[PDB]
From a paper:
COP1 contains an N‐terminal zinc finger, a central coiled‐coil, and a C‐terminal WD40 domain, which is essential for proper COP1 function (Deng et al, 1992; McNellis et al, 1994). COP1 regulates gene expression and plays a central role as a repressor of photomorphogenesis by directly modulating the stability of transcription factors that control the expression of light‐regulated genes.
We find that both peptides bind COP1 with micromolar affinity and with HY539–48 binding ~ 8 times stronger than UVR8406–413. Next, we solved crystal structures of the COP1 WD40 domain–VP peptide complexes representing UVR8406–413–COP1 and HY539–48–COP1 interactions, to 1.3 Å resolution. Structural superposition of the two complexes (r.m.s.d. is ~ 0.2 Å comparing 149 corresponding Cα atoms) reveals an overall conserved mode of VP peptide binding (r.m.s.d is ~ 1.2 Å comparing six corresponding Cα atoms), with the central VP residues making hydrophobic interactions with COP1Trp467 and COP1Phe595 (buried surface area is ~ 500 Å2 in COP1). COP1Lys422 and COP1Tyr441 form hydrogen bonds and salt bridges with either UVR8Tyr407 or HY5Arg41, both being anchored to the COP1 WD40 core, as previously seen for the corresponding TRIB1 Gln356 residue in the COP1–TRIB1 peptide complex (Uljon et al, 2016). In our HY539–48–COP1 structure, an additional salt bridge is formed between HY5Glu45 and COP1His528. In the peptides, the residues surrounding the VP core adopt different conformations in UVR8 and HY5, which may explain their different binding affinities.
Numbering used by the authors:
A (entry chain A): 348 to 363, 372 to 407, 411 to 675
B (entry chain B): 39 to 46
The structure:
Amino acid sequence: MTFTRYSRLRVIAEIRNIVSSIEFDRDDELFATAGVSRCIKVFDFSSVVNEPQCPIVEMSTRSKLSCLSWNKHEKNHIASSDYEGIVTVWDVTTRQSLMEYEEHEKRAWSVDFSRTEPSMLVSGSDDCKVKVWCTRQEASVINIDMKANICCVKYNPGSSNYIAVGSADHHIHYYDLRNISQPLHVFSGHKKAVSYVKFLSNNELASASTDSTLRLWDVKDNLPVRTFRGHTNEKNFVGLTVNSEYLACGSETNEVYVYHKEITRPVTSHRFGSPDMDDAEEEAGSYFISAVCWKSDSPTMLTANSQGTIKVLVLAA
Amino acid sequence: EIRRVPEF
């Protein structure tokens, strides 16, 4: 029943370079995109779905962007991490940078605003440090020296005391920020760098890696659960988004994949740029999906690829 | 390459 509830992704809207990050605001009303074009763009979701297209805010940045995270309490605030290492908090109504955190010494691949302590945000960098910041303070409040490049950091959705850290050392380091001498647990299983970590719930953590797998982990009992396979991801950040039941990720075949958390093989997938009639130009391997984001626990998702095309997709029977 | 994931 679960495997067969949905068999396809329907395209319900399309905006037609690399988009590194696509994220919904606190209420799933606006979404923002950012990437190599050094421009944070904010769109109204309903307008995109209903109309035959223009962002409502554009904020120019000095450096290429790697990640966005909206504040979970302050509707109008969004954080970005950039390739200079700067972690910026922006106000999308005034367009101003509210904070410019400059301690990282190399590109910051990831930033995440906490859901439960919403002034707290965490970043990770090629400088091998995890930094925790508070929007009321200019200096970092916690620093973890990880000794390998950090590709992704994510707060637990139920408590700001726990973060998952995906590392180029192939492991997920799960920290209690109240005692950083050692992580609570380090999860091994991926055979390549861990590019994303995202929580389905307080106790369920998912990861993506350039070993062409996603993995599901139990962070209450510190157990491996399941490995998901089907997509191609051997090189790039191709996006990971999860909700209470589903995982979605990109692929280096210009395809989005969806998995139900209980089944190791995809429930469906969607090709960007499938040829029609006599089309005979670039092959599928020439583009990658670069960012994905569920609309909370619904079957609706945002997706973007390395050409800059954005699609709103919906799981359907 | 700008989105290449690092290896240790």
